[PDB]
């Protein structure tokens, strides 16, 4: 019923009868900022909080743990190999 | 002071939405 | 004959060596049955030993090595405590030398498929998989169990899980590592692992 | 236990 | 090797200590069923400081949860990580010390000494050589302030050469819970100053003030407040269980800071404490750890250090530090805060290198400070206690069990002697 210039928007309330069916709850937003500067999904993107609790500022873990002696006092020819991959000379 | 749901932009709404969403 | 006489390894040993002693007997002053020093074996078949990225590694790689079977379990909390200490000792002996020096075959006592996968993604050394009956015959050959499920043949309980143990060429017991044993000296017994007379020739 | 023979 | 004996006293010490073994099990990777998970070398390499192998492969904490009201430790059972402690490590209670220092210390706690000193000397003698004691106990209630300090007197008098440590939460001037605040406050302190090695203070409304501004949370529970304190507990003994370039022992911390035997009271901070809305705004650098840690509002005790002057203090960094960017900048904060540090000690400030960070961080820092800024917090303890004591109020329940007028005045005079000793050293 749109060929005759429909003037009553009551037809769009038959399906969302309880208003708590989560289909019309926050489904549209038509302010000028979201109609001029907006890309495909970079508005409704969840933010990374933590995975180790409130003390976790971000993700480091114990798999990234090596002490200063074990990290750099390593066997020499392995360091000769891995610096060769990144400009030893 | 009235306290509303995290949808409303009254008092804080950025970090208030994240740990207990509502 | 070592370390036990009643094992699936040594009963297949005393079988296989005996008919080929018969093959030399009817072909020919041979003596029957053949001696223990005269018997020889292949311990691990062609498709047994699997490395980290799940490709075939030949048995021939194991010359000039100190190879050791590490009885273990993912859910066992003794094993979860001894696991990074064995990770330390395996690491520091490989690149502590110009040639790779020690080697551990991972032989497991896990519940199911997914249990071994969680206990294998963190292992650098070789392993044997559970559905192959080499795992079952090896644990009776070394007399290793959690508790008494299967009846031992008049034997006791030599080790408790875990116990890493260095092996010989013909399956002989080389020298014992008492993680939990009569010595029961935990978390340090990998220091006793010498690599001079324990060579897999 | 019965021990292996040392190398002669 | 080194062993630390943990004791939880009072309602607060049980909840704070519950979140201590929450975070320590997170550092070393212990599944709450007892087994280990994490497959790292250095997590359990030094594990005997807080754990004992129990011939099942599990790691029982060396802690003794201990009170007189059974409900608050029964909720430790119902809560997470209540399965690690031994059942023998619990000292039961039936009557419940109802916020009375006299009931906790003298009369009803006396028959529970024979069970808690029996279990602490059993776990002490089970090792080769003990290192130190650590407790968490409250100064606001009765089962923490009165009966917790019971344990302090015997353990010091039967292990004199060893050291001990307290995490003491204090009554608050702004918010008023447990109307018998200053009796438990003064009665705990004068006994504490003669049988404690070093005591370091925690204030409740400083913990709420952190969670309001720097953490920026609307309404969480006490579990967040215990998370900050467990961050400080993890820090202050991180090097006792992890390596470092410039190490730190708990009694290294004692020798390097305490001048004089009468003053051993410290102020505790921890950094970083920033909201997740500013984690993208925060590019984690060594100087912004230091300026955060030298912020009066970051402190876990709500005593303002701008009024007082720091005598000596120690900063303990964790993680991977460019240590010259640590220590010449640790000079650089001494130089701008020339009026915030005392004049007769060159190098008032100490640096420490713990080589392992906490969970979810590349680097953190734990602050401990011997300051003259505690004398204002002890000043309104004096003003509260004198108002309670001007014409013989609130204290006949104490004297009904054997208190004397002679000894309350000694509690007041000893602690006024202590706030006097802070006052001259300015
Ligand atoms: N930091 C902290 N403080 C607490 C906790 N529970 C209670 N408190 C404080 O302790 C006071 C209650 O007295 P309390 O010491 O628990 O009485 P008790 O049962 O005799 O130990 C209140 O003022 C609270 O602010 C907690 O879990 N953590």
DSSP sequence for E364-379: EEEEEEEEGGGHHHHH
Q: What angle do CA E161, E164, E169 make, to 5 degrees?
A: 160
Confirm if C108 and C119 have CB atoms less than 8 A apart. Answer: yes
Burial class (CB in 10 A: 0-12, 13-18, 19+), E50: buried
HSE, side-chain direction, 13 A CA sphere, residue A79: 7
DSSP sequence for A12-68: GGSSSSSS-SSSSTT-----HHHHHS--SSSSS------SS-TT-SS---STT---H
- Are A65 and E274 inside 8 Å of each other by CB? no
Distance CA(C44)–CA(C137), nearest Å, equals 12
Nearest CA to ligand 1 atom 25: E204
DSSP sequence for E27-85: HHTB-TTS-B-S--TTTSTT-TTTEEE-SSS-EEESEEEE-S-HHHHHHHHHSTT-SSS
- Touching status, chains C and B (3+ beta-carbon pairs under 8 Å): no
| Backbone CA torsion sign across E235, E270, E267, E384 | negative
Confirm if E49 and E73 have CB atoms less than 8 A apart. Answer: no
Those chains having 3 or more beta-carbon pairs within 8 angstroms of chain E are A, B, C
Is the Cβ atom of E10 under 6 angstroms away from ligand 1? yes
Is the Cβ atom of E15 under 6 angstroms away from ligand 1? yes
For residue E140, report the distance from its CA to the centre of ligand 1, in Å: 7
Distance CA(E283)–CA(E129), nearest Å, equals 44
Distance CA(C86)–CA(C89), nearest Å, equals 5
Distance CA(E294)–CA(E307), nearest Å, equals 14
Cβ count near E340 (within 10 Å): 18
Is the Cβ atom of E222 under 6 angstroms away from ligand 1? yes
Distance between terminal CA atoms of chain C? Answer: 19
Structure tokens, E93 = 């209670």
* Nearest atom within ligand 1 for CA of residue E97: 20
Smallest CA–CA distance, residue A51 to chain E, in Å, is: 8
Confirm if E397 and E100 have CB atoms less than 8 A apart. Answer: yes
Distance CA(E12)–CA(E20), nearest Å, equals 12
- Can you tell me which residue has the tokens 């890493």? C164
Structural biology method used: cryo-EM
Rounded to the nearest 5 percent, the helix, strand and coil shares of chain E are: 40, 15, 40
| Max Cα-Cα span within chain B | 22
Q: How far is CA C128 from the centre of its chain?
A: 10
C162 preceded by a cis bond (ω within 30 of 0): yes
Give the H/E segment covering residue A76: helix A76-84
Distance CA(E81)–CA(E58), nearest Å, equals 13
Q: Report in angstroms the alpha-carbon separations of E272 from A30, B19, C178, E253, E298.
A: 39, 19, 46, 22, 9
Distance CA(A80)–CA(A86), nearest Å, equals 10
- Are E276 and B15 inside 8 Å of each other by CB? yes
Residues of A in contact with E282 (CB under 8 A): 57
Q: How far is CA C5 from the centre of its chain?
A: 16
Distance between terminal CA atoms of chain E? Answer: 41
Provide the 8-state DSSP code for E169. E
From E75, E137, E204, the mutation candidate for ligand 1 (largest count of ligand atoms within 8 A of CB) is E204
DSSP sequence for E194-243: TT-SEEEEEEHHHHHHHHHTTS--SS--HHHHHHHHHHHHHHHTSTTTS-
HSE, side-chain direction, 13 A CA sphere, residue E277: 13
Is the Cβ atom of E12 under 6 angstroms away from ligand 1? yes
* 3-class secondary-structure state, position E340: helix
Distance CA(C138)–CA(E193), nearest Å, equals 64
Confirm if C164 and C67 have CB atoms less than 8 A apart. Answer: no
Closest CA to E72 of E141, E120, E121: E141
Nearest CA to ligand 1 atom 16: E11
Distance CA(E379)–CA(E281), nearest Å, equals 40
Is the Cβ atom of E25 under 6 angstroms away from ligand 1? no
Query: Resolution, in Å, please?
Result: 3.5
Chain D interface test: which of C2, C35, C142 (most D C-beta within 10 Å): C2
- Can you tell me which residue has the tokens 């236990």? D1
Distance CA(C157)–CA(C146), nearest Å, equals 9
Distance CA(E104)–CA(E115), nearest Å, equals 15
Residues in chain E: 426
From E10, E12, E224, the mutation candidate for ligand 1 (largest count of ligand atoms within 8 A of CB) is E12
**What phi, psi does A49 have (nearest 5°)?**
-90, -65
Nearest CA to ligand 1 atom 15: E141
């Amino acid at each position: 019923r749109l060929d005759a210039h429909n003037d009553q928007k009551l037809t769009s309330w038959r399906i969302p009868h309880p208003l708590y069916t989560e289909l019309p709850q926050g489904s549209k937003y038509e302010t000028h900022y979201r109609q001029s500067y907006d890309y495909e999904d970079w508005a409704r993107r969840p933010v990374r909080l933590s995975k180790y609790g409130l003390l976790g500022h971000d993700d480091s873990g114990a798999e990234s743990w090596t002490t200063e002696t074990r990290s750099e006092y390593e066997p020499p020819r392995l360091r000769r190999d891995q610096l060769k991959a990144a400009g030893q000379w | 002071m009235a306290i509303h749901v995290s949808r409303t932009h009254r008092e804080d709404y950025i970090r208030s939405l994240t740990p207990r969403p509502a | 004959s070592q370390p036990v006489f009643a094992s699936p390894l040594n009963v297949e040993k005393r079988r296989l060596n005996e008919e080929r002693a018969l093959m030399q007997a009817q072909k020919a002053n041979i003596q029957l049955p053949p001696n223990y020093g005269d018997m020889d074996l292949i311990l691990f078949p062609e498709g047994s030993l699997k490395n980290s990225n799940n490709t075939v590694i030949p048995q021939s790689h194991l010359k000039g090595k100190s190879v050791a079977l590490y009885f273990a379990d993912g859910a066992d909390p003794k094993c979860a405590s001894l696991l990074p200490f064995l990770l330390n000792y395996y690491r520091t002996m490989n690149e502590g030398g110009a040639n790779q020096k020690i080697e551990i075959i991972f032989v497991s006592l896990d519940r199911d498929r997914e249990a071994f996968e969680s206990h294998r993604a963190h292992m650098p050394w070789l392993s044997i998989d559970l559905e192959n009956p080499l795992t079952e015959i090896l644990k009776r050959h070394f007399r290793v169990m959690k508790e008494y499920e299967v009846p031992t043949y008049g034997y006791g309980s030599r080790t408790g899980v875990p116990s890493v143990i260095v092996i010989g060429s013909d399956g002989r017991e080389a020298q014992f590592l008492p993680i939990c044993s009569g010595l029961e000296e935990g978390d340090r017994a990998l220091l006793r692992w010498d690599w001079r007379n324990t060579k897999f020739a | 236990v019965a021990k292996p023979l040392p190398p002669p | 090797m080194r062993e630390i004996v943990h004791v939880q006293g009072g309602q607060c010490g049980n909840q704070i200590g519950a979140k201590f073994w929450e975070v320590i099990s997170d550092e070393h990777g212990i599944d709450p069923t007892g087994t280990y998970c994490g497959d790292s070398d250095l997590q359990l390499e030094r594990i005997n400081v807080f754990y004992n192998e129990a011939t099942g492969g599990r790691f029982v904490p060396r802690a003794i949860l201990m009170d007189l009201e059974p409900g608050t430790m029964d909720s430790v059972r119902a809560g997470p990580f209540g399965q690690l402690f031994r059942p023998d490590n619990f000292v039961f209670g039936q009557t419940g010390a109802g916020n009375n220092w006299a009931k906790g210390h003298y009369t009803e706690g006396a028959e529970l000494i024979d069970s808690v000193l029996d279990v602490v000397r059993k776990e002490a003698e089970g090792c080769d050589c003990l290192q130190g004691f650590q407790i968490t106990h409250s100064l606001g209630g009765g089962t923490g302030s009165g009966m917790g300090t019971l344990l302090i007197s015997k353990v010091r008098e039967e292990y004199p050469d060893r050291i001990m440590e307290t995490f003491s939460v204090f009554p608050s001037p702004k918010v008023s819970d447990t109307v018998v605040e200053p009796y438990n406050a003064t009665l705990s302190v004068h006994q504490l100053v003669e049988n404690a090695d070093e005591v370091q203070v925690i204030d409740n409304e400083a913990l709420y003030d952190i969670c309001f501004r720097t953490l920026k949370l609307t309404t969480p529970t006490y579990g967040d407040l215990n998370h900050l304190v467990s961050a400080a507990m993890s820090g202050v003994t991180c090097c006792l269980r992890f390596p470092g370039q410039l190490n730190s022992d708990l009694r290294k911390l004692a020798v390097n800071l305490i001048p004089f035997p009468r003053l051993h009271f410290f102020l505790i901070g921890f950094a970083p404490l920033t909201s997740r809305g500013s984690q993208q705004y925060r590019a984690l650098s060594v100087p912004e750890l230091t300026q955060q840690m030298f912020d009066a509002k970051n402190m876990m005790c709500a005593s303002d250090p701008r009024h007082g002057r720091y005598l000596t203090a120690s900063a303990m960094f964790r993680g991977r530090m460019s240590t010259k960017e640590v220590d010449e900048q640790m000079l650089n904060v001494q130089n701008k805060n020339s009026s915030y540090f005392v004049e007769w000690i060159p190098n008032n400030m100490k640096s420490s290198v713990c080589d392992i960070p906490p969970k979810g961080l590349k680097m953190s820092v734990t602050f401990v400070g011997n300051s003259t800024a505690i004398q204002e917090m002890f000043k309104r303890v004096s003003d509260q206690f004198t108002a309670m004591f001007r014409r013989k109020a609130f204290l006949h329940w104490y004297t009904g069990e054997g208190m004397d007028e002679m000894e309350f005045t000694e509690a007041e005079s000893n602690m006024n002697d202590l706030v006097s000793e802070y006052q001259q050293y300015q």
